[PDB]
RNA sequence: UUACUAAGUCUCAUGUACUACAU
RNA sequence: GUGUAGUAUCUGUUCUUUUCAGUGUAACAACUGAAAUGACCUCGAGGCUC
């Protein structure tokens, strides 16, 4: 059952082994030095291998051996209505090829203004606050903002089928057009 | 529409005392 | 005071129940060499429209198993669907499955549903180890998905009894266990949580291992539980002495099927065969033959041919060569027919000539050598014909003549010879003999 | 740099000793 | 160099009805009794749920 293998004894200071953990100590029973179990027989050893103990204390053994120009363009406020309650609509115009013929090298040039609503609680100056402003950026251009006094207008609910592009967030998507063709931005 | 293809230790911990969910405060 | 029940739910296609028996007989030589013992039972069907399933089960059979039936479908389909207890051995892998679990699924379909207060099950399979019953219950689950009148329940050790005992608690049509575990489940809270009594239909998987793994204690008591008019299938690889003693214990009137057990013909006769290509080639090899066995110097030898006017021409033919026969077939009068016998068993080295039809019954001993000389075109035939030499240790030799057309001819000595006997001829010969059986196999 | 604790019960097998009892 | 009966000790293997109440226990363990069925929600856990 041994297959002919020769199993040096522990004290012979270690040929390599199948093996190199069941052991001969100074007696002569068989060892395993990581369960520090005693074997009769090389049966009794192979039962040992083949049992979930060794196993055990095999992976124990090898977690041990891991162990900005600013230009203020121009908006187009308009109280609008539809059906059923009240919203607001800007029409936000932009350059007529005056300037932007010195800038055309696709730097997010394909990338459309951005709006974001913005709480009053944090400004440069930082004196009155309490309202929120309904920003509006282009890269070129001069940031814009609108103060929006009622708690909520225009607010809707599920307007469009559920489709997941979610472009910079659900407001933009969900309420701006950008006519980049003749560079008007219109949001409501 | 578009979904194409291509081409153990059981009664030891019993034992150590989780037939009963200790708790401490 | 027992309830009664349905086992029979097997109606013969037409086309099956017009077959003859020696038609039958050839179908299960063909089949493998399926053998049975036994009494009344049903002929073997070779396609599952011959069964009568719905086509729901037949579209999802085909699907669950794909190309022709196998031997043990075959045979065990319509025996089990028949209601008969039955013992199958054949190898695993050999579509057993749904040999039971077919007949099993209606057998426990017709009857009434389980009551508020019955728990089940109704159909019982038992295997010895987890990885079987797992493997059987997700068989069973391919058709309990659909209907949803019927639930399979896989008990097994090496694993969660209370997530077991969770099913259970709902009631379950069918189970499917090892046999410690389905016993302790049994025994278990007074035995409230599963009940025996309504079980018609036990099936034991790779029943050998019940035995090597000890479970007889376990299934004998299982048995002892069950109704004892309960229909109960026995599958097994192989026949062990404690197997059969077992089937004897629980089995009525059982069918027996055993695939190719041993070969078609005797092993000690030595199966051998040429090509020819023209019926005087065929003479040509038929003479050196004969000659050739006299440097071997009972010893005698028959020639086999397929009809009458075939065996005058060639004992006149072998006459004109030097070559004395004793001609024997059925349109010669009796009493000359009993002069050449009797010279044939007389004379030493005698050959005789005689139509393949009269074999079975010939009333001479063993012989030496038999020549096919028209190639044989049934398994039944060619079992009658070369066994007219079988003897144990003192087997001789059959040798078949072929011709290049004679394509069910090779397809026969394809399937009855031994392997390494087509290995010690020539290997061309051998090619040609494959291919003629292919060809033919291919022309069906 | 890993701050020091694991086997138990059952089942079916193997390892090894032993105790009365007979040639 | 044997046989009858019987014993002890390794090792392998494996986790027995989910719960409740009583006995029991240092606490366990173990033992003694019964049994839910259905629906729903979030990530086997969870419910002043019905």
Same mark, same amino acid.
């Given at each position: 059952?041994?297959?002919?293998?020769?199993?040096?004894?522990?004290?012979?200071?270690?040929?390599?082994?199948?093996?190199?953990?069941?052991?001969?100590?100074?007696?002569?029973?068989?060892?395993?030095?990581?369960?520090?179990?005693?074997?009769?027989?090389?049966?009794?050893?192979?039962?040992?291998?083949?049992?979930?103990?060794?196993?055990?204390?095999?992976?124990?053994?090898?977690?041990?051996?891991?162990?900005?120009?600013?230009?203020?363009?121009?908006?187009?406020?308009?109280?609008?209505?539809?059906?059923?309650?009240?919203?607001?609509?800007?029409?936000?115009?932009?350059?007529?090829?005056?300037?932007?013929?010195?800038?055309?090298?696709?730097?997010?040039?394909?990338?459309?203004?951005?709006?974001?609503?913005?709480?009053?609680?944090?400004?440069?100056?930082?004196?009155?606050?309490?309202?929120?402003?309904?920003?509006?950026?282009?890269?070129?251009?001069?940031?814009?903002?609108?103060?929006?006094?009622?708690?909520?207008?225009?607010?809707?609910?599920?307007?469009?089928?559920?489709?997941?592009?979610?472009?910079?967030?659900?407001?933009?998507?969900?309420?701006?057009?950008?006519?980049?063709?003749?560079?008007?931005?219109?949001?409501? | 529409?578009?979904?194409?293809?291509?081409?153990?230790?059981?009664?030891?911990?019993?034992?150590?005392?989780?037939?009963?969910?200790?708790?401490?405060? | 005071?027992?309830?009664?029940?349905?086992?029979?739910?097997?109606?013969?296609?037409?086309?099956?129940?017009?077959?003859?028996?020696?038609?039958?007989?050839?179908?299960?030589?063909?089949?493998?060499?399926?053998?049975?013992?036994?009494?009344?039972?049903?002929?073997?069907?070779?396609?599952?429209?011959?069964?009568?399933?719905?086509?729901?089960?037949?579209?999802?059979?085909?699907?669950?198993?794909?190309?022709?039936?196998?031997?043990?479908?075959?045979?065990? @389909?319509?025996?089990?669907?028949?209601?008969?207890?039955?013992?199958?051995?054949?190898?695993?892998?050999?579509?057993?499955?749904?040999?039971?679990?077919?007949?099993?699924?209606?057998?426990?379909?017709?009857?009434?549903?389980?009551?508020?207060?019955?728990?089940?099950?109704?159909?019982?399979?038992?295997?010895?180890?987890?990885?079987?019953?797992?493997?059987?219950?997700?068989?069973?689950?391919?058709?309990?998905?659909?209907?949803?009148?019927?639930?399979?329940?896989?008990?097994?050790?090496?694993?969660?009894?209370?997530?077991?005992?969770?099913?259970?608690?709902?009631?379950?049509?069918?189970?499917?266990?090892?046999?410690?575990?389905?016993?302790?489940?049994?025994?278990?809270?007074?035995?409230?949580?599963?009940?025996?009594?309504?079980?018609?239909?036990?099936?034991?998987?790779?029943?050998?291992?019940?035995?090597?793994?000890?479970?007889?204690?376990?299934?004998?008591?299982?048995?002892?539980?069950?109704?004892?008019?309960?229909?109960?299938? @026995?599958?097994?690889?192989?026949?062990?002495?404690?197997?059969?003693?077992?089937?004897?214990?629980?089995?009525?009137?059982?069918?027996?099927?055993?695939?190719?057990?041993?070969?078609?013909?005797?092993?000690?006769?030595?199966?051998?065969?040429?090509?020819?290509?023209?019926?005087?080639?065929?003479?040509?090899?038929?003479?050196? @033959?004969?000659?050739?066995?006299?440097?071997?110097?009972?010893?005698?030898?028959?020639?086999?041919?397929?009809?009458?006017?075939?065996?005058?021409?060639?004992?006149?033919?072998?006459?004109?060569?030097?070559?004395?026969?004793?001609?024997?077939?059925?349109?010669?009068?009796?009493?000359?027919?009993?002069?050449?016998?009797?010279?044939?068993?007389?004379?030493?080295?005698?050959?005789?000539?005689?139509?393949?039809?009269?074999?079975?019954?010939?009333?001479?001993?063993?012989?030496?050598?038999?020549?096919?000389?028209?190639?044989?075109?049934?398994?039944?035939?060619?079992?009658?014909?070369?066994?007219?030499?079988?003897?144990?240790?003192?087997?001789?030799?059959?040798?078949?003549?072929?011709?290049?057309?004679?394509?069910?001819?090779?397809?026969?000595?394809?399937?009855?010879?031994?392997?390494?006997?087509?290995?010690? @001829?020539?290997?061309?010969?051998?090619?040609?003999?494959?291919?003629?059986?292919?060809?033919?196999?291919?022309?069906?």
């Amino acid at each position: 059952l041994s297959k002919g293998e020769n199993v040096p004894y522990t004290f012979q200071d270690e040929q390599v082994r199948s093996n190199p953990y069941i052991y001969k100590n100074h007696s002569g029973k068989l060892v395993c030095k990581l369960c520090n179990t005693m074997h009769m027989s090389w049966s009794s050893v192979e039962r040992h291998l083949g049992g979930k103990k060794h196993g055990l204390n095999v992976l124990r053994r090898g977690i041990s051996i891991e162990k900005x120009x600013x230009x203020x363009x121009x908006x187009x406020x308009x109280x609008x209505x539809x059906x059923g309650s009240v919203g607001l609509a800007i029409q936000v115009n932009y350059s007529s090829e005056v300037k932007e013929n010195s800038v055309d090298s696709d730097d997010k040039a394909k990338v459309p203004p951005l709006i974001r609503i913005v709480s009053g609680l944090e400004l440069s100056d930082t004196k009155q606050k309490g309202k929120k402003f309904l920003v509006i950026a282009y890269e070129p251009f001069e940031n814009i903002a609108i103060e929006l006094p009622p708690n909520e207008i225009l607010f809707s609910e599920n307007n469009d089928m559920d489709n997941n592009n979610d472009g910079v967030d659900e407001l933009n998507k969900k309420c701006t057009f950008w006519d980049a063709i003749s560079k008007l931005y219109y949001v409501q | 529409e578009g979904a194409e293809q291509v081409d153990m230790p059981y009664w030891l911990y019993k034992l150590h005392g989780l037939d009963r969910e200790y708790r401490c405060e | 005071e027992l309830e009664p029940f349905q086992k029979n739910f097997y109606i013969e296609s037409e086309t099956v129940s017009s077959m003859s028996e020696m038609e039958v007989e050839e179908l299960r030589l063909s089949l493998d060499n399926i053998k049975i013992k036994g009494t009344g039972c049903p002929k073997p069907v070779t396609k599952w429209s011959q069964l009568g399933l719905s086509t729901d089960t037949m579209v999802l059979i085909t699907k669950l198993h794909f190309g022709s039936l196998t031997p043990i479908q075959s045979q065990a @389909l319509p025996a089990i669907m028949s209601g008969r207890d039955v013992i199958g051995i054949s190898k695993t892998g050999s579509g057993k499955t749904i040999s039971y679990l077919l007949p099993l699924l209606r057998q426990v379909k017709a009857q009434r549903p389980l009551s508020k207060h019955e728990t089940g099950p109704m159909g019982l399979i038992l295997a010895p180890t987890r990885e079987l019953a797992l493997q059987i219950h997700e068989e069973v689950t391919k058709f309990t998905e659909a209907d949803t009148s019927i639930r399979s329940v896989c008990c097994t050790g090496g694993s969660e009894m209370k997530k077991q005992i969770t099913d259970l608690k709902r009631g379950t049509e069918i189970v499917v266990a090892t046999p410690g575990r389905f016993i302790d489940i049994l025994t278990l809270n007074d035995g409230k949580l599963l009940s025996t009594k309504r079980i018609t239909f036990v099936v034991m998987d790779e029943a050998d291992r019940l035995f090597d793994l000890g479970f007889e204690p376990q299934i004998t008591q299982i048995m002892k539980t069950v109704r004892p008019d309960k229909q109960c299938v @026995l599958f097994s690889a192989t026949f062990p002495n404690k197997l059969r003693s077992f089937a004897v214990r629980v089995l009525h009137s059982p069918i027996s099927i055993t695939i190719n057990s041993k070969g078609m013909v005797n092993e000690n006769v030595k199966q051998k065969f040429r090509i020819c290509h023209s019926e005087d080639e065929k003479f040509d090899n038929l003479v050196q @033959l004969i000659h050739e066995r006299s440097e071997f110097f009972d010893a005698k030898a028959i020639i086999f041919v397929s009809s009458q006017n075939i065996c005058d021409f060639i004992s006149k033919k072998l006459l004109n060569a030097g070559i004395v026969t004793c001609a024997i077939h059925a349109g010669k009068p009796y009493q000359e027919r009993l002069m050449n016998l009797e010279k044939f068993k007389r004379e030493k080295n005698s050959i005789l000539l005689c139509t393949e039809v009269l074999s079975r019954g010939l009333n001479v001993p063993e012989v030496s050598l038999v020549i096919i000389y028209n190639a044989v075109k049934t398994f039944a035939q060619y079992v009658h014909t070369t066994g007219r030499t079988a003897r144990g240790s003192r087997s001789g030799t059959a040798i078949t003549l072929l011709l290049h057309d004679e394509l069910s001819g090779a397809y026969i000595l394809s399937k009855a010879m031994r392997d390494e006997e087509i290995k010690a @001829l020539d290997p061309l010969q051998a090619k040609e003999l494959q291919e003629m059986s292919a060809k033919f196999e291919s022309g069906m």
